[PDB]
Structures are given as structure tokens and as C-alpha cells.
């Protein structure tokens, strides 16, 4: 009741009333009211990172958030928070950064109290026990154990490592069961007392901020949050910070050489800079990021493309902890790009000096500020979970008025700070890091935490005083005036024939359309998507392999053009699919024709630059064979899909048939793919119907004019089918993951086709076991960190599956899955009526749920139009059937389909095992699959779903 805000800045598009305030204990509290919300939510953000761990025990903050979910004193039950949040269509999640820790959930329509009080008790008083600390370090072990081979983490921790080892930046965030449990009891240090001291010392102070997205009012719930978080008492803890940047000059001007596990090649150029979060109005780091990492005519990337060294580069500044900041230029390399690294970084300082001779620019600032203002003014709607965590995550830095207008509105252009940050980029401030797999036997030093190998080649002063000596220019230039900036912001009015669902308007043997004027959102922007078909796209590996090469070289030769469209707010995307290729252009309403047209005319009338083809061929050949270095459960989900379809070729087939694709072969292939084809598309958003027909008209007329496209026969508009397992079966086949020391498994129960009365059986049964599966297979039995069980839907045919990876041998896992099945049905027949209607209500709220963003319903319409079902109302009638279901019905679904004695039992299993590898029921004999194609030769195939 200390501070109340009067009115804050909101976009005139929003409707959500806001209020900011501050409590007696100094918590910055933000209140959001919404009359038309449907899932309320809340979050909190304690400003304590993993950079405040004690030196003996490493990774307490992460172990603490990981242990806080389990157990309080006002709710001694182990799962009452998770169980109550999952009975009400909600989900809770949390994480720790290096500087702070976010806690956030969401909940159903009005159940704020019964879940907010559970989230509040979270911090008033937690109670731990032997059990939790005893079976949680196994989950933190799986956490580290999935990232010891994870290539996004080894460089992160190796940059954390080779710095100032007396500095708090050189700290470990995770803990690997050895420093957490085994080291402190190696020397008798207790852990529970350390956890209660950590929590009572750090977390309880002013530091944390809260936010709640309420339904009721902006005065009904302000008096709610003043009586519910008032207990946490300010201990006057100042924010931990440290003015000394971790890079001291002894370890500057140095060039490491790191050896990866998966085959990649990269060059990181690291500069240290002081803190510029205090300067959040001029934002000099975004200026130099806009001027360095910019594709287009005559810029840093396009020249490195032109010399054949570099595929892409990312500029901008990395932000680390508080009181210090970084600045990174990270590049990847071609085969002979790794020979000329000194010349690459020489060109980088060439472009820097070309930007230092001319310095600041007024019109670039005005352009960027106009772009952020227009991008703020039509800011789309937010999903209420994740949004409140974001605006609680930046609430520590900014005052109450501009909590929303953060990095969107800019007041002044001050060239002095541009010049300041542009002076700190000097080759006395460099730290080069090279990643290449060619250094296998050359590395002396190794990492202790993760076990990676690297070097010290400190750069002698030859090449430093070759870098800053004489830097005039290459063929660089500044970017030119933008023409994709939008000018039309007019909402077109609703016409006479206004429909709630997209209607078929054109139906010819060449194309079809699906059109709907936007009725809800009124944003001057629309999304257009297309799916071109060809029977030649997946005939054999060679023709399934040329498709990715052609499409990729199209994206290569057109990014140079269309980066200004992706920068102004018009994004396109063109990738291949199994049946044919695909296209999706979304964004502001004004410049779709220009962009789409240019995409088509670059698509049909397409030449090949030979060196570009020869680069992309190798960059894909090195992207097939490094599929073997990847997670076990992803290999399970890869193998299961290949076996359960009519035709598909492995990653071992396609990389053998890349020894044949050549330029003349590919060059006659493009007229073969675009010779006869068929188009299917939806148009969505704010467009009139005559302009919709004009869009498809220009599209198919350009393909007529340049490609001589003819329509396909309707008997070769076909899909693929799914293998039908025998009425009683136990299919399993094992493969061996080569580089991960874990095992993994996926088991598949296939029921039937897409019906309106049989999707709700499997959906409800996958909702009744969603929490107990997590609760008894990850928490209680501690089988690993990756546990998931839900509906899998391919080709219409629905099946319930289980993805799980662990240290244990996999048939042990499949047996204890069966134990979970038995315990589940025993818990189903015992459960009461009221909880059963609660589960039905949780599914009727989760599924009967309106999409907020316009792309969230265009991806709801398109995802079924590409499945040829065309059923737009399956969210209403299906859930109207869900309300009339009985308790015995689920047992009738269960007994003959999922049970062990069932007559109708379809089950196939994929075992991925490792490099060197409570009552269980009785399993029948398996039959092993030693060959996929001889397997798929003797089984029938399901029929396809008839359209609506």
C-alpha cells in the first residue's frame, strides 16, 4: 500500500485494463484485468540466480526450485499443487537463470484462489524431507546427463570455464549428483541445512516481483494480492552485483580450438563491453547490431557469401549477469572457410572501420524507431501464460509506467554512446574461438565439468597489427532505403456473405481456395499459405533428395532480396514436404503481392550458381550423417514413424544416393517437378474476396506462363497409408544409439481411425493418466527426466504412446509401463463421480478454447485442410459429445484395446539402447522385426478418412 500507479502506457489496440502498485514489503506488483479471458494465470520472479551458490555445494538454486514444488506445511501432500493445477486445465513450470528465477503457472476460468493460495504457500514456508532430497538428485543427474553430449551446452560452460576461475561467472549451474550429493557427504557437509539457510537468506526479501492476469476487476483482486503475499517479509537484501568484468587482460587476445562431437564448424568473435542496460532509451547495442548483422546488397554477410567462405552470420550483443555485457559476431564455416580465418576476421574489422569512418546515421535511427513504433501499435494478443512471466521478468529494471513499452519506444538518438560502444570494438579486445572437429589428437587441455577438449593458441602480434593497420574498405556499403515499410493500415469492412468458417470459393482441376475475412482481430495483416503437389517428389531417394537441394538453393538465392521483408514484418517460409513443396507468407497487409509474386518468378525461372550448389551439397551431406549424434528418444520417434507408414526411406538411404546428384541431373529435375502439379491453399485475414481470387490468379498464371504447368489427373492425387498391426501382437525392434550413454524407448498402442465418438475415448484416457504418469514414473520411481504419454495421430489413425529415456535397460521400462497400466485401471474403477466430472470439465475447457493470435487459428484451419478432412467444427460437436460419457465407457474402451488380455491389442515398440549396453505382470512372447520392408510386406493397410 506504499505506491499506486495512476495510468500507464498501453497500445490503443489492447483492451486489458492495467494497474501497477507496490506493497508494504517492497514488491513491485502488476495487475491485469480482462473481462473476456478464459484461463487466468500468474507468475513471480525472484531476483536470485545461480551466481549466488556457495563454493562448496554447486547448483543450489536449481536444486531449490526443483525441490520447492514438492511439499509445504499447509499442504503436506506431495503433489497437491500439481494435482490441483492439472485437475483444472492448467500447467505449472519454472526455471532458473544465472541471475534470477521464474515461477509461473496458469489455471482455469475462475479457479484463482484454490491455485493462487497453493502458489503463495510456495514461499511462506516450505518443508523438505529425506525422501525428496533423496530422489530428486537423480532427476538433476538426468538433467546434466542429457547435456553432457548436448552441443548447445558444451560451449556455454566452456566459455564459463576459461575466464577468471576465481570469479562468480566461473560457476556451474546444474550439479551432476556428484558435487550435489556425493561431495558433501564425502566430507560430511549436510545439505538440508544449506537449503533452509539459502532460502531464508536470499529468497524472502523485496527482490521478488509478482504478476497476476485476473478476470474479475482491477479492484476485486488488488485487495486479493495485498492479503496473500503480505507475509513474505523484507530482509533488506541488496541486489548482488559486481563491477569487475570477468575478462582480465591476461586472457585477452586469445584463440581457442575446441573439438565438438557432432560435425560443425564455427568461429566466435567475443568482445567485452560495459553495462548498457542503464541506457534503455538510445540503445547503442541495437544500433550496432542492426548495422553489423544485416543481409542485403553490399553488406558484411553478402561479401563473405561472394568469396564462398560463410553460409550465414549473427551479430548483436550478448547480455551476461549484471554490471557487465558481451558483444558477439558468430559465424559458421565452409570447407575452405576454415583455412582463411584470419582473413575473415580481417574483413570483420574492415566493415567495422567502414562504419567508424562515417559513424552515426540519423535516418537509420528514425527508420528503426518508426519500425518499432508500428510494430508496437499493432502488437498482437498474448497467451496469458508466458506473458505474465515475461512482464514479471523485466519488472525489476524499469519503472511502473513503461513496464509494457520496453524496447519498443525510443526517445532520443545520442551519437555519443554509439561512438562509445563503437570504440570498444578494437583488436586489443578480441577473444577468438574456433570450433572444428579436425583437432582430435591435438588438444592438451580438457574440461573437468563437461569433458571437452580445447587449446591455447594465443594470437601473436603479427596478426593483431595486421588487423588494425590499414583498413579502407572491401566492396561494402551501407544498406539502402527500405521499401517494405508499410503505409496501408486500413481495416477493410465486412461484406454481405460473412461466414464463420473458411469457404471453398474456387474449385478447378488446377487449384482450390479457402477464404475468410477476419472477424475478431481487426489487425491490418493477413496470412496466405500454399501447398504445391507433385507425384515426383518422393518417388525414390534421389528424387526425395533433389527436392531439399533445389528448395534450399532457392532460399539461398532469395534471402538477399527478402531480408528487408522479414525485417519490416513480412515473413515467408518455403520448405519441402513429403507429398510436394510448401509455402507460407504472413505479415502486414500491404506488401504481400510484390513478395509472393517475386517468390514465384524466382521459383519457376531458376538457374543454379555452381559453387553455391557445391557448398549446399556438402552442407547437407554433413547434415545427414550427424543424425547419429542425437538423443535416444528422438531416434525412437524417428524409427516408429518410418515403420508405421506405407513408404519412407531411412537417413541411411538418402546419404548413399547423394553420391549421384550432379548439376546437370538436378537441372533437368526442376522442369520435371514443375511440369504437372496441383495447388491447394487458404487465404486468411483482412482481404477482400476479389483480391483473394486475384492472388490465386496471379499465382497460377505465373506458373502457367513460366513453367508450362498442366493439371494432374485426379487419380494421382494420393496420400500415404498406415500399416495395420494384427489383432493380437507384440512388435519390438532394437537399435543402438552410438554417442549417448542413455537408453530410450517408445511403445505404441494403436486403436483405430478418426471418428467423432472414438477420438474422445482416447483423448479422455490420455487426460486421466497425464498427471499420475508423471507422478509415479518420474517422481516416485525416478525413471529419468524425459517422460511423456499422450495421443499420437498420424494419417487419422489414433494411438496412445509412451516416450521415456533412462539409464535402465529398456525392457525393464516396458514392464513398469505395464505396471502403470494395471495400477491406472485399478485407480479408475475406485475413483468417485465428482473427480470424473472434473476430468471431463478439464478436457472440455482445454479443447473448447479460442485462439488468440491470428496465426493460431490459421494453423488450426490449415492443419486439417492438409489432412483432407475439412472438418472445422470438430471443436464444438466433438466436445458436445464429450459431456455425455459414462464411467463404464472408459472401461469398455480400456478392456479390449489397452489391457494385457485384450482381444484387440495392437502394440509396437522401438528400443534405442546405449553405447555399451510396484508389481510387474506377465508378458507374452515378442516377435522381433529384423527388416522393415519385409515387415511391411505382410500386413494390411488402413483406409483413408473420407472427407466431410
Amino acid at each position: 500500500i506504499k505506491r499506486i500507479g495512476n495510468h500507464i502506457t498501453k497500445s490503443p489496440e489492447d483492451k486489458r485494463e492495467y494497474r501497477g502498485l507496490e506493497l508494504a514489503n517492497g514488491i513491485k506488483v502488476l495487475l491485469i484485468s480482462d473481462p473476456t479471458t478464459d484461463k487466468s494465470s500468474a507468475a513471480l520472479d525472484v531476483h536470485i540466480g545461480s551466481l549466488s551458490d556457495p563454493p562448496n555445494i554447486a547448483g543450489l538454486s536449481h536444486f531449490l526450485e526443483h525441490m520447492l514444488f514438492l511439499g509445504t506445511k499447509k499442504y503436506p501432500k506431495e503433489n497437491e499443487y500439481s494435482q490441483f493445477l492439472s485437475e483444472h486445465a492448467g500447467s505449472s513450470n519454472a526455471f532458473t537463470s544465472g541471475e534470477h528465477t521464474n515461477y509461473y503457472f496458469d489455471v482455469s476460468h475462475e479457479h484463482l484462489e484454490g491455485a493462487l493460495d497453493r502458489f503463495a504457500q510456495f514461499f511462506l514456508s516450505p518443508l523438505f524431507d529425506e525422501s525428496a532430497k533423496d530422489r530428486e538428485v537423480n532427476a538433476v543427474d538426468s538433467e546434466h546427463e542429457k547435456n553432457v553430449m548436448n552441443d548447445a551446452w558444451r560451449l556455454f560452460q566452456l566459455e564459463k570455464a576459461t575466464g577468471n576461475p576465481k570469479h562468480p561467472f566461473s560457476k556451474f549451474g546444474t550439479g551432476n549428483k556428484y558435487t550435489l550429493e556425493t561431495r558433501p557427504n564425502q566430507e560430511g557437509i549436510d545439505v538440508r541445512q544449506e537449503l533452509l539457510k539459502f532460502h531464508s537468506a536470499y529468497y524472502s526479501s523485496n527482490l521478488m516481483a509478482v504478476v497476476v492476469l485476473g478476470r474479475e476487476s482491477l479492484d476485486d483482486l488488488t485487495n486479493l494480492v495485498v492479503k496473500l503475499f503480505s507475509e513474505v517479509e523484507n530482509k533488506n537484501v541488496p541486489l548482488p552485483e559486481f563491477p569487475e568484468h570477468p575478462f582480465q587482460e591476461e586472457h585477452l587476445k586469445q584463440l581457442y580450438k575446441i573439438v565438438p562431437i557432432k560435425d560443425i564448424r564455427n568461429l566466435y568473435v567475443t568482445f567485452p563491453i560495459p553495462d548498457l542496460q542503464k541506457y534503455y532509451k538510445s540503445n547503442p547495442g541495437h544500433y550496432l547490431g542492426h548495422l553489423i548483422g544485416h543481409e542485403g546488397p553490399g553488406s558484411l554477410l553478402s561479401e563473405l557469401k561472394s568469396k564462398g567462405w560463410v553460409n550465414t552470420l549473427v551479430g548483436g550483443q550478448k547480455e551476461g549477469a549484471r554490471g557487465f555485457m558481451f558483444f558477439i559476431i558468430n559465424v559458421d564455416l565452409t570447407e575452405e572457410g576454415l583455412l582463411h580465418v584470419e582473413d575473415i576476421i580481417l574483413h570483420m574489422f574492415q566493415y567495422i572501420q567502414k562504419l567508424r569512418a562515417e559513424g552515426p546515421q540519423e535516418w537509420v535511427f528514425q527508420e528503426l524507431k518508426d519500425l518499432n513504433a508500428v510494430a508496437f501499435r499493432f502488437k498482437d494478443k498474448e497467451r496469458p501464460r508466458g506473458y505474465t512471466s515475461k512482464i514479471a521478468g523485466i519488472l525489476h529494471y524499469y519503472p511502473l509506467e513503461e513496464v509494457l513499452t520496453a524496447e519498443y519506444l525510443l526517445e532520443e538518438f545520442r551519437p555519443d554512446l554509439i561512438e562509445m560502444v563503437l570504440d570498444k570494438l578494437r583488436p586489443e579486445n578480441v577473444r577468438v574461438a574456433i570450433v572444428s572437429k579436425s583437432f582430435e589428437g591435438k588438444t592438451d587441455r580438457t574440461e573437468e565439468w563437461y569433458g571437452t577438449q580445447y587449446k591455447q593458441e594465443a594470437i601473436p602480434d603479427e596478426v593483431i597489427k595486421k588487423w588494425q593497420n590499414a583498413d579502407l574498405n572491401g566492396k561494402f556499403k551501407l544498406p539502402t532505403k527500405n521499401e517494405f515499410i508499410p503505409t496501408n493500415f486500413e481495416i477493410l469492412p465486412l461484406e454481405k456473405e460473412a461466414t464463420p468458417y473458411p469457404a471453398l470459393i474456387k474449385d478447378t482441376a488446377m487449384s482450390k481456395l479457402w477464404f475468410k475475412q477476419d472477424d475478431k482481430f481487426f489487425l491490418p495483416k493477413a496470412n496466405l499459405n500454399f501447398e504445391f503437389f507433385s507425384p515426383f517428389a518422393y518417388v525414390d531417394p534421389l528424387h526425395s533428395n533433389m527436392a531439399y537441394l533445389y528448395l534450399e538453393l532457392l532460399k539461398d538465392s532469395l534471402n538477399e532480396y527478402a531480408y528487408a521483408a522479414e525485417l519490416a514484418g513480412l515473413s515467408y517460409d518455403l520448405q519441402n514436404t513429403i507429398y510436394g513443396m510448401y509455402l507460407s507468407v504472413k505479415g502486414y497487409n500491404d506488401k504481400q503481392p510484390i513478395l509472393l509474386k517475386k517468390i514465384i518468378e524466382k521459383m519457376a525461372t531458376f538457374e543454379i550458381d555452381e559453387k553455391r550448389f557445391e557448398i549446399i551439397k556438402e552442407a547437407y551431406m554433413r547434415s545427414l550423417n550427424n543424425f547419429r549424434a542425437e538423443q535416444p528418444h528422438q531416434h525412437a520417434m524417428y524409427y516408429l514413424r518410418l515403420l508405421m507408414t506405407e513408404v519412407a526411406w531411412t537417413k541411411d538411404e538418402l546419404k548413399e544416393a547423394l553420391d549421384d546428384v550432379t548439376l546437370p541431373r538436378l537441372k533437368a529435375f526442376i522442369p520435371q517437378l514443375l511440369s504437372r502439379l496441383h495447388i491447394e491453399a487458404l487465404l486468411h485475414g483482412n482481404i477482400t474476396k476479389q483480391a483473394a481470387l486475384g492472388i490465386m490468379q496471379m499465382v497460377e498464371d505465373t506458373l502457367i506462363e513460366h513453367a508450362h504447368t498442366k493439371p494432374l489427373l485426379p487419380s494421382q492425387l494420393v496420400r500415404y497409408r498406415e500399416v495395420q498391426l494384427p489383432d493380437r501382437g507384440w512388435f519390438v525392434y532394437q537399435q543402438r544409439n552410438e554417442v549417448h550413454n542413455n537408453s530410450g524407448i517408445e511403445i505404441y498402442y494403436q486403436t483405430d481411425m478418426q471418428s467423432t465418438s472414438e477420438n474422445m475415448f482416447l483423448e479422455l484416457f490420455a487426460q486421466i493418466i497425464s498427471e499420475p504418469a508423471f507422478n509415479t514414473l518420474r517422481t516416485k520411481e525416478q525413471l529419468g527426466y524425459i517422460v511423456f504419454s499422450g495421443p499420437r495421430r498420424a494419417n487419422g489413425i489414433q494411438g496412445l504412446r509412451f516416450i521415456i529415456q533412462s539409464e535402465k535397460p529398456p525392457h525393464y521400462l516396458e514392464s513398469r509401463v505395464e505396471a502403470f497400466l494395471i495400477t491406472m485401471e485399478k485407480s479408475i474403477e475406485d475413483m468417485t463421480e465428482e473427480a470424473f466430472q472434473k476430468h471431463i470439465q478439464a478436457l472440455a475447457i482445454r479443447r473448447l478454447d479460442k485462439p488468440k493470435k491470428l496465426s493460431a487459428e490459421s494453423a488450426k484451419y490449415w492443419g486439417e485442410i492438409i489432412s483432407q478432412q475439412y472438418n472445422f467444427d470438430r471443436d464444438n460437436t466433438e466436445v458436445a459429445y464429450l459431456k455425455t460419457l459414462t464411467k463404464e465407457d472408459i472401461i469398455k474402451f480400456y478392456k479390449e484395446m489397452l489391457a494385457v488380455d485384450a482381444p484387440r491389442r495392437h502394440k509396437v515398440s522401438v528400443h534405442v539402447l546405449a553405447r555399451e549396453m510396484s508389481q510387474a505382470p506377465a508378458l507374452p512372447q515378442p516377435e522381433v522385426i529384423q527388416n522393415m520392408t519385409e515387415f511391411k510386406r505382410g500386413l494390411p493397410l488402413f483406409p483413408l478418412v473420407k472427407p466431410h
Partner: peptide, 9 residues
């Protein structure tokens, strides 16, 4: 958010 989470998302 390279940040560890309580539950896989």
C-alpha cells in the same frame, strides 16, 4: 527463456 526447467515443455 540454455536454461534448465522443472518440466520438459
Amino acid at each position: 527463456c540454455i536454461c534448465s526447467l522443472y518440466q520438459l515443455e
